[PDB]
Scaffold this active site. Structure first.
Site, PDB file in Angstrom:
ATOM      1  N   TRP C  97       0.965  -1.408  -0.132  1.00 28.85           N
ATOM      2  CA  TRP C  97       0.215   0.023  -0.033  1.00 28.85           C
ATOM      3  C   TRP C  97       0.919   1.346   0.001  1.00 28.85           C
ATOM      4  CZ3 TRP C  97      -1.589   4.671   1.396  1.00 28.85           C
ATOM      5  CH2 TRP C  97      -2.834   5.012   1.301  1.00 28.85           C
ATOM      6  N   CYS C 204     -10.863  -0.819  -6.426  1.00 27.23           N
ATOM      7  CA  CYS C 204     -10.887   0.245  -5.381  1.00 27.23           C
ATOM      8  C   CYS C 204     -12.416   0.593  -5.108  1.00 27.23           C
ATOM      9  CB  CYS C 204      -9.928   1.572  -5.832  1.00 27.23           C
ATOM     10  SG  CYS C 204      -8.297   1.362  -5.266  1.00 27.23           S
ATOM     11  N   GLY C 205     -12.715   1.024  -3.884  1.00 25.30           N
ATOM     12  CA  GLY C 205     -14.028   1.880  -3.752  1.00 25.30           C
ATOM     13  C   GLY C 205     -15.263   0.830  -4.128  1.00 25.30           C
ATOM     14  N   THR C 500      -0.552  -1.307   8.805  1.00 26.01           N
ATOM     15  CA  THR C 500      -0.074  -1.535   7.527  1.00 26.01           C
ATOM     16  C   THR C 500       0.722  -0.334   7.098  1.00 26.01           C
ATOM     17  OG1 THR C 500      -2.149  -1.166   6.648  1.00 26.01           O
ATOM     18  CG2 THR C 500      -1.602  -3.369   6.889  1.00 26.01           C
TER      19      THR C 500
END
Ligand code: ACO
Ligand code: ACO
Lengths: 723, 304, 733
Positions: C97, C204-205, C500
Site C-alpha cells: 500500500w 478500489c471503492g 499497515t
C-alpha cells in the site's frame, strides 16, 4: 538554399529570438545560437513539464520580487509531504542534498551530506516529487469533472504545478558532469537548480576560483538552451564561512588571498613526524608526502624555537599517562596552539593589508579590493611600497591557498556570478537580517533587479538569537522586503518526519490502538484528506480506468455510528436563532485548532460572506480521573447588535455537549464575561458560579438542564432562544 | 574487561593480523586496525564473492609474475562475451569506462569516455558480468551432476570465477566518492579496481590534466581503507597518465616540481593574458561569437 | 571422487537443515538433492537475512509461548524505521500500500493494485535495511568513544532488520515468486507475506470483485518461496495470508478444498448471469447509447441473447433500460456512468433473487425437510463426493454454479471466517505464520479464526492486520479497551500485529501541520519544533550526529592520514540541573545520601501535559508533578496541576514539593497555579505555602479547585544566586 540549410537557419533564428527575449536580460552566454542548434540533432524532443514550469515559476518569482514579497518553503522528505504543502497553499518546493544523503536509496547507504552519492541521486528523488504532483493534479481534475458547477465553486482546487528548485551541489565535476546533471533534472521535470562554488568531496571549507563557478553556470545554461527549457539557475556562494580555495589563478579571488618563517606545510608535517618518532605510531600522515631533509630541518628549527616540539613532548607524556588511548583530543590541542603560533609569527594578512601597513589610505583599500596580484604589486612599486608577501608559504598540506572568508568575499563572488545566474544565494549558518541586508544591498547597488534566495538551517537554534516570538513570525517577510524571493528550511521534512515517527511509536507502546484512534480524531477535526486515504492516492480515477480497460465487464458487485457531536447540530440551533431575530444570514460553524497542531481550539461562527460573527478560543483539559473542564481564554460576539440574544449561550451548550464538560473556567475574564456567566447561572446552564474578579471565573455545569435542552424535540431549547 | 571491550580488542587483533599478512607486504596504510574496526558496527556482513575472488585472483597473478608470464584479455561488452572468454580459457576479465560510456544506460545517453556518468555506472555494468559468471557456474554444475563419472572426465569444466579488474576512473571526487565507488564494486562482487591520477571532468591531443601525487595516494589509501572495512583483500591498480600529460592542477607536491615547465625570458607577459588579449581583439574587430574573455576580469595593465 | 563427495556432503548438510526443529510440521515438495543442484560451486552467503531470520523466528516463538506479541506499523521512511527501534519496537512491517502510494522515479504513485514491478517493495526494503545497518554502525562508533560508566548509562538500541515485507500474490507463477523472494533476501529481508488473490484483479471503492485463487496455487507459491529460501540457506519467515473473509469470487473450481464454498443457482430455468448482463448492455447500445459497447468484448450466440432477453423482459429490467435511456436523452446525452450503475445494481439483485443462489450443502439441506450430520459432511466434501452422498440419500436438488459465473469466468464463493479457516488450514503445513485479512478490528472474529487454527495446529503462530482507515471510534469500545486490544491479540497467539501504512498517515499529518504552521507563524514554527525536540531529548536535535557525521570525520581522518585541514552558549530554558542542585542541598540537610535526578517529559507522547519526576539511584520515582502550562489571551502563564506526589511518607513535610514548585514557577514564568480536584493534603500544602510567602493569595473551592497566586518578590528572593534565602527555606529557619 537547400532544405537542409533552411531548416538550420530557421532554428538558429528561433534560438536567437529565445536568447534575446526579456527572460535572459542581463544574462551573458559564452556561446552562440548556432552552437546550441548543432547539438540538437534532427529528431524532435520536448521537455514540456520542465519548460512550462520554468516559465510560470520564473514569472511568479519576478512578480513577488517587484512586490517585495517572497515564498517561504521547506524540503519535503516524501511525495506526500510535497503534495501536502501545495494543499496548504505553499507555492514552491525546495529539494536539498542533505535530505537526499540522509534518506539513501536501495544501493546508497544513508549518511552525511558529502555529495558523495551518484550525480543521479537528487534528480531520482525529484522525479518522485514531480510524479506525485502530476498525479495529484490528475486525481484532483478527475474528481472535479464529476462535480457540478456549484460544487466546483464551493470546493477549492489546489495548484500542483512542479515549482521546484533542486540541489545540483557543485556540479559533480566539470562541464560534462554539470550538463549531465542538469539534463537528468530537466528530463524528470525540474525547472530550477542550484550550484555552489565549493570543491567537490572536501566537505576546512574549500572554494573554487570564480572562472570555474561561472563555467558551471554557463555549462548549465548551455544544456538548458539545447533542451529549450528556460530553467532557473541559482548561483550559491559558500564564501561567507570559507577559509580555503584550491587555486589562486582567478584575479577576482586574489584580493582575499592571505600570505606571510618556514612553510605552514613543512611545519605541520615536522610536528606530525615528531609525534610518530616519540612513539605515537597512529600519526603517520607524514608518509603521505616526500618532503626533503632541508625542509624538515628548517621546519624543525622553527617548531623548537616556538616551543611546539615542547608541547608535543608534554602531549605524548599525557598520552602515555592516560594509558595510550585515542590521541584525537590531545593532537587537536597541540594543532590549535601550533596554528596560532604560525599565524602569529608569519604575519598573516592580505596583500592590500600588507601595503596599507607600509595615495590616501582609503584610496588604496578601494584599489586593492578590485585589483589582481600583478596589478596591486605594480601600483605599490610605483608608490614606492614593496612589502614582503608570500601566499605560497601559507598553503595547506593539500595545496589549498588561504582566503579571508566573510560577507565581503560572498559579495565579490556573487557579483562575478550575477550575469550568469537568475538567483544569487549567500550560504549562512546564522539567521540574521543585518548579514542578509549587507549582502542584499551590495548586490542591488550594482544589480537592482537581481532576485535572491535565503537558506534557513533547521539546526540553527532560534531561541538563542534573543528574538521575540513576533520577530520570528516576521523574519520571512523581512527577507522578502530585501528581495530574497525564495526562502527555504532545507531539510524541514526530514525533521518533522522524525518527530512524528518518535511520537507515534511511543504512543503505540503507551496507549496501544488508542494511539491510532487519537490520530484519526485529529484528522477528522482538521478535515485532512488522509481521513479517506483510498481517495487520496486516486482510487476513484483508478476504478474509471478499470471500467474503460474492461468495457464495464469487470465485476465490482457482490451476491450473498457518530464519533463526535457534529457541527451541523449547532448550525441547526443557529438557524432557529437566526429565524427568531430575523437575520437573513445562514450561519456556518467551524472548529479548528487556533494554530497548527495546538490543543487550543477556536470555534467560529461565520456568515455567508465568511465574516466571523462570533468565536470562542478554548482548550479541553482532563483532571487525574479523566473529568473534563473547558478552559476559555477568549470569547467574542463581535457585532454589538447580535449581543444579549443568547448566541454565546447556544455555543456553550454545544461545546459542553461536544466535550462532555463538567465545568468551564474563564481565565482573565472581562466585565462582559462576569455579566454573561452570572445570567447563564439564572437560565440554569450552571449550578454554581465563582468569580475572582479580573482573574478567573469557575462555572459548574447543570447536567439535568443540559440533558433537558438537548432533548430531540427542542421544546426546552426553543423556549431558551425566544426567552 | 567487559564483553563489549573484549569483542573490540578481538576484532582489532584479527584486523591487525590481516594487515600484517604477507598479502600486504610493502603496503603502507595511513590508518590503524582500530580505525577500521570503528567503522564496522555490530551486525555481521560478508562480501564473500569479492573476498574469495580477490584471494584466488591475487595469488594467481603473483604466480604468473614469478613465472614471468601473464594474462592477455579484453573488455567484454555483454555478459555473454564475458562467459564466452572464460570458456575459451581466458583466466581474467577487464571492464573499462570507455565501453561503459559508449553503451550508456536507460537514463544515460551513450557518448565519449569523459567519466561523466554517475559513479554507480561501471559497478552496475560489472554486476551483470558477475551475475552472468555465477549463473554460468550454477548451470554448468547442474548439468555436470546429471553426468556420469566417465562423462565428467571426458567433457571439460570451465572456470567462471569473477576475476575482474574494473575502472574506478579518477575516484569521482574525494575520499567519500572513492570509498562509495569501491563499496559499490565490492557489493556486486568485483575484486579489482583501477584509479588514475587525472583531474575529474577534464578529459578532451593535449589538455590532459594530472593531480598532485598526494591526492592520488589518498585515493588509493581511501580505497584500501574501504576494502579493509569490508574484509576484502581487493586488488588496487594505480594508473598514471603522466606519459602523455601536459598539465597539472597544482604545483604543491614536491614529487611533481622537477617536471614543472617555466618561462626563462621573464619580460614576456603571461600565457593567460596573451590568450585573452588575442580573443578580445577578435571580439573588438567584430566577431561577437568569440566572447570568452568575458569569463575573466583581467586588468587594463595586463591587457596592455 | 572429490566431486561426488562435495555433493553428498552438502546434501547431508541440507538434509540436517530440513530436519531441524525450525521446520517442524513443514512439508516440502522437493528433496535436499533438488536444492543442492541449484546452488552451483562458487560460494555465496546472504548473512544479513540469514542471521536476522534466525533471531527473529526464535523471538516470535518466544513471544508465542508467553502469549505476548509485537505491535508495530509500516515506516514510510528509513528515519521512521530507525526511530521505531529507538522507541523500543522490536520488528518492522513493510506493505505494498505505502510502496504504491510513494511511487518511485519511474513509477507514478497510486492505489494498491500491486501493479508496480515486482522489484518495487524489495527496493523499498533495501533502504530500510541500509538505514538500520548504518544506524548500528553509527551507534557502535559513538559507543566505542564512551567510557565503561558512560556505556552503562546511555542505552544501546537494537537495529537488527526484523522485517516482514509484502510479496503481494507472488507477481505470477513460481519463477516470479522465487525471483521476488531472491530480491528480498539479497537486500537482507528475513520475512515475506503472500496472499491467495489473483494478480491484477484488485478493485478500489467497491465491496465486490475480490478474486481468490485455488488452494493448490497458493500452496505452490509458498512452496516455491521455501525452495528459493532453502537454496539461499536463509531460514526465512513465510507468512501465508488469506483474503477469503471478504472475498466473493474465485478464478477456478478445480480444487476440492474450495468446492464446499461455491455458490450456484437452484432455479435452472434462469439464463446465465453472463448472458443476462451482456444482453442488458446490448440493449443500451441498440437504444443508442454508443458508449456502452462492452458486449463487443464477447462473441455470444443469438440463442443465448434470446433466452437472456426473455428473462430481462419478464423481470422488467429492459423496462428500466428504456426509462434510463429516456432520462439520458432528457438530460441531453451526458455521462451515463451514474444511470447505468442504478440499473446494474437492480439487475444484479433481480438475478441473485430469482436464481436462488446458495452452496450445494445448503441446497441439499433444503431437500432434507440428520440436518447437522450433513452440514459437517458437505463442509469437508468435494462436489463429486457431495453429489454421490446426496443421491445415495435420495436427494438430488437442481444446482448449477456455472450459471452464476461472472463475464470474466470467475466462480462465486461464500466468503467469511469459515472460508478463511479452510484456506489457512490447507496452507498451515507450508507456512510459518498464518494471517486472516480483516477490515474490522474485532476480537471475536479474531478468536473464531485463532481457535479453529489452534484446534488442529496448537503451535501455529498468527498475525493480525490493523487498517489505518478503520474508524476505531465507531466500534463503541472504551479508550481502555482500545489500549488493551493489542495485548488481547497476543493472548490468542497473534504474535505479529501491524498498522499497515501507519507511516504514510503520520507523514501526512506532520507535513500538513508544519506547512500550516509556517504560513501562520513564520520561523516560530521551526522554533516550536526545536523546543519540542529539546524537551524529549530527540536525536533530531543534533541532526549532523544523527546521520553519522562523527563516524564520517573518522573516515576522512583515516583516508587523509590526519592531513586534511580542520583549522581556520545562550540558555533557552531553565535547566533541570538547577533543581538537582537544590535537591542536593535538600538531600544533604535531611542526610538522605540518594543522588536525586530531575526528569521532565510529556506524560504521554506529543501531549501538552508534562510530568516532572524526581528519581533515585535505583530509578524509583520518589516524587512527581503532572501539570500543564496554559496561557491566557495576553500570554500570561498559569500552571495547571492535575496530580502531585511525594510517594515516600518519610519524605513528606520537608518542603520537597515546595522546591519543585519553585523550579516549575521559575521554569514556566508562572503567575498562578491551579490545582484541579485537590485532596485534603493539597489544601494543607497550599495553605502553608501561602504562609512561607510563595503565594500571595490562595482560594479553595473544597474538592473542586485551588487557585494560588504567585508572590513574585519572594520567588526572586529565593532565586538569588547566593542561595541564602533558599538555604533557610530548606532548613526551616
Ligand atoms: C472569555 C474571556 O476569558 S474574556 C473575553 C471576553 N470577551 C469580550 O469582552 C468581548 C466583547 N464581549 C462580548 O462579545 C460578550 O462578552 C460575549 C462574548 C459574552 C458575547 O455576548 P453574548 O453573545 O450576548 O452572550 P449571551 O447573550 O449568551 O449571554 C448570556 C446571558 O448574559 C447576558 N448578557 C450578556 N452580556 C451582557 C451585559 N453586557 N450586561 C448584562 N447582561 C449581559 C445575556 O443577555 C444573556 O442573558 P439574558 O438573555 O437572559 O438576559
Ligand atoms: C494536585 C491534585 O490536585 S491531587 C492532590 C495531590 N496529591 C495527593 O493528595 C497525594 C498524597 N499527598 C502527597 O503526596 C503530599 O502530601 C503532597 C504532594 C500533597 C505534598 O508533598 P510534600 O512533599 O508533603 O509537600 P511540602 O513538604 O512541600 O509541603 C509544603 C508545606 O505544607 C505542609 N504540609 C504538607 N502536607 C501536609 C499535611 N498533610 N498536614 C499538614 N501540613 C502539611 C508542609 O509541612 C510544608 O510546610 P512546613 O514545612 O511549614 O511544615
Amino acid at each position: 538554399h537547400t532544405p537542409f540549410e533552411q531548416d538550420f537557419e530557421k532554428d538558429v533564428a528561433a534560438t536567437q529570438r529565445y536568447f534575446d527575449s526579456s527572460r535572459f536580460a542581463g544574462i551573458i552566454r559564452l556561446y552562440t545560437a548556432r552552437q546550441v542548434v548543432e547539438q540538437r540533432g534532427t529528431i524532435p524532443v520536448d521537455h514540456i513539464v520542465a519548460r512550462e514550469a520554468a516559465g510560470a515559476f520564473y514569472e511568479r518569482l519576478r512578480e513577488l520580487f517587484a512586490a517585495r514579497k517572497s515564498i517561504t518553503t521547506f524540503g519535503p522528505y516524501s511525495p506526500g509531504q510535497a503534495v501536502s504543502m501545495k494543499r496548504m497553499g505553499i507555492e514552491a518546493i525546495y529539494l536539498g542534498g542533505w535530505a537526499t544523503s540522509a534518506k539513501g536509496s536501495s544501493t546508497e547507504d544513508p549518511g552525511p551530506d558529502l555529495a558523495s552519492y551518484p550525480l543521479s541521486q537528487v534528480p531520482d528523488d525529484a522525479a518522485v516529487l514531480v510524479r506525485a504532483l502530476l498525479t495529484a493534479d490528475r486525481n484532483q481534475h478527475y474528481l472535479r469533472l464529476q462535480m457540478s458547477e456549484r460544487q466546483r465553486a464551493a470546493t477549492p482546487a489546489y495548484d500542483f504545478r512542479p515549482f521546484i528548485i533542486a540541489d545540483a551541489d557543485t556540479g559533480h565535476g566539470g562541464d560534462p558532469h554539470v550538463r549531465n546533471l542538469i539534463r537528468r533534472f530537466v528530463e524528470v521535470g525540474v525547472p530550477g537548480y542550484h550550484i555552489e562554488d565549493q570543491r567537490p568531496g572536501t566537505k576546512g571549507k574549500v572554494l573554487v576560483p570564480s572562472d570555474e563557478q561561472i563555467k558551471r553556470l554557463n555549462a548549465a545554461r548551455f544544456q538548458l538552451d539545447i533542451m529549450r527549457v528556460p530553467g532557473i539557475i541559482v548561483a550559491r556562494t559558500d564564501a561567507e564561512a570559507a577559509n580555503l580555495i584550491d587555486s589562486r589563478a582567478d584575479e577576482r579571488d586574489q584580493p582575499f588571498l592571505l600570505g606571510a618563517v618556514p612553510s605552514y606545510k613543512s611545519c605541520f608535517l615536522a610536528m606530525v613526524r615528531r609525534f610518530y618518532e616519540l612513539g605515537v605510531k597512529e600519526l603517520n600522515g607524514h608518509l603521505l608526502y616526500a618532503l626533503g631533509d632541508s625542509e624538515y630541518a628548517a621546519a624543525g628549527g622553527w617548531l623548537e624555537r616556538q616551543g611546539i616540539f615542547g608541547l608535543v613532548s608534554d602531549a605524548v607524556n599525557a598520552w602515555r599517562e592516560d594509558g595510550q588511548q585515542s590521541i584525537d583530543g590531545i593532537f587537536d590541542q597541540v594543532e590549535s596552539r601550533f596554528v596560532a603560533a604560525w599565524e602569529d609569527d608569519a604575519g598573516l594578512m592580505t596583500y592590500g593589508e600588507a601595503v596599507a601597513d607600509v595615495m590616501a589610505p582609503e584610496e588604496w583599500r578601494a584599489f586593492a579590493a578590485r585589483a589582481s596580484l600583478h596589478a596591486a604589486r605594480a601600483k605599490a612599486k610605483e608608490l614606492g611600497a614593496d612589502p614582503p608577501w608570500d601566499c605560497e608559504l601559507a598553503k595547506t598540506p593539500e595545496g589549498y591557498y588561504q582566503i579571508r572568508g566573510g560577507i565581503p568575499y560572498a559579495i565579490a563572488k556573487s557579483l562575478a556570478a550575477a550575469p550568469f545566474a537568475d538567483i544569487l544565494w549567500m550560504e549562512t549558518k546564522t539567521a540574521d537580517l543585518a548579514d542578509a541586508r549587507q549582502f542584499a544591498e551590495a548586490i542591488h547597488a550594482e544589480f537592482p533587479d537581481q532576485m535572491l534566495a535565503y537558506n534557513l538551517s533547521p539546526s540553527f537554534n532560534w531561541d538563542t538569537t534573543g528574538m521575540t516570538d513576533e520577530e520570528m513570525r516576521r523574519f520571512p517577510e523581512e527577507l522578502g522586503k530585501m528581495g530574497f524571493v525564495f526562502n527555504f528550511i532545507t531539510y524541514g521534512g526530514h525533521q518533522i518526519d522524525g518527530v512524528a515517527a518518535e511520537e507515534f511509536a511511543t504512543a503505540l507502546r503507551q496507549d496501544g490502538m488508542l494511539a491510532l484512534a487519537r490520530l484519526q480524531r485529529k484528522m477528522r477535526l482538521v478535515e485532512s484528506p488522509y481521513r479517506t486515504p483510498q481517495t487520496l492516492v486516486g482510487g476513484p480515477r483508478s476504478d474509471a480506468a478499470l471500467a474503460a480497460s474492461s468495457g464495464r465487464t469487470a465485476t465490482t458487485k457482490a451476491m450473498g455510528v457518530q464519533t463526535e457531536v457534529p457541527r451541523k447540530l449547532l448550525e441547526e440551533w443557529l438557524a432557529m436563532w437566526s429565524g427568531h431575530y430575523q437575520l437573513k444570514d445562514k450561519l456556518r460553524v467551524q472548529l479548528r485548532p487556533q494554530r497548527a497542531g495546538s490543543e487550543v481550539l477556536e470555534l467560529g461562527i461565520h456568515g455567508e460572506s465568511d465574516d466571523k460573527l462570533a468565536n470562542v478560543i478554548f482548550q479541553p483539559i482532563q483532571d487525574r480521573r479523566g473529568r473534563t473542564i473547558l478552559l476559555v481564554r477568549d470569547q467574542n460576539t463581535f457585532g454589538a447588535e447580535l449581543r444579549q440574544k443568547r448566541l454565546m449561550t447556544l455555543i456553550h451548550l454545544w461545546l459542553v455537549h461536544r466535550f462532555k464538560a463538567q465545568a468551564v473556567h474563564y481565565v482573565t475574564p472581562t466585565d462582559d464575561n462576569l455579566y454573561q456567566t452570572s445570567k447563564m447561572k439564572s437560565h440554569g446552564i450552571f449550578t454554581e458560579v465563582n468569580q475572582e474578579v479580573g482573574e478567573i471565573i469557575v462555572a459548574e455545569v447543570n447536567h439535568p438542564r443540559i440533558a433537558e435542552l438537548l432533548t430531540p424535540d427542542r421544546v426546552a431549547l426553543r423556549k431558551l432562544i425566544t426567552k | 574487561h567487559t564483553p563489549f571491550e573484549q569483542d573490540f580488542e578481538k576484532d582489532v587483533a584479527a584486523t591487525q593480523r590481516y594487515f600484517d599478512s604477507s598479502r600486504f607486504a610493502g603496503i603502507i596504510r595511513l590508518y590503524t586496525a582500530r580505525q577500521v574496526v570503528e567503522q564496522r558496527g555490530t551486525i555481521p556482513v560478508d562480501h564473500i564473492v569479492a573476498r574469495e575472488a580477490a584471494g584466488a585472483f591475487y595469488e594467481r597473478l603473483r604466480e604468473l609474475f614469478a613465472a614471468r608470464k601473464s594474462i592477455t584479455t579484453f573488455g567484454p561488452y555483454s555478459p555473454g562475451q564475458a562467459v564466452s572468454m572464460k570458456r575459451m580459457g581466458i583466466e581474467a576479465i577487464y571492464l573499462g569506462g570507455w565501453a561503459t560510456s559508449a553503451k550508456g544506460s536507460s537514463t544515460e545517453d551513450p557518448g565519449p569516455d569523459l567519466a561523466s556518468y554517475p559513479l554507480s555506472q561501471v559497478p552496475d555494468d560489472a554486476a551483470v558480468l558477475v551475475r552472468a559468471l555465477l549463473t554460468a557456474d550454477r548451470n554448468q554444475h547442474y548439468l555436470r551432476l546429471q553426468m556420469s563419472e566417465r562423462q565428467r572426465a571426458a567433457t571439460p569444466a570451465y572456470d567462471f570465477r569473477p576475476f575482474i579488474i574494473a575502472d574506478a576512473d579518477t575516484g569521482h571526487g574525494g575520499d567519500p566518492h572513492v570509498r562509495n565507488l569501491i563499496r559499490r564494486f565490492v557489493e556486486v562482487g568485483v575484486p579489482g579496481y583501477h584509479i588514475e591520477d587525472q583531474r575529474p571532468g577534464t578529459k578532451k591531443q593535449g589538455g590532459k590534466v594530472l593531480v598532485p601525487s598526494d591526492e592520488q595516494i589518498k585515493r588509493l589509501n581511501a580505497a584500501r581503507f574501504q576494502l579493509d572495512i569490508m574484509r576484502v583483500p581487493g586488488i588496487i591498480v594505480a594508473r598514471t597518465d603522466a606519459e602523455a600529460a601536459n598539465l597539472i592542477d597544482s604545483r604543491a607536491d614536491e614529487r611533481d616540481q622537477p617536471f614543472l615547465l617555466g618561462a626563462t625570458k621573464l619580460d614576456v607577459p603571461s600565457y593567460k593574458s596573451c590568450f585573452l588579449a588575442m580573443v578580445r581583439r577578435f571580439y573588438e574587430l567584430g566577431v561577437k561569437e568569440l566572447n570568452g574573455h568575458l569569463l575573466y576580469a583581467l586588468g587594463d595593465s595586463e591587457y596592455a
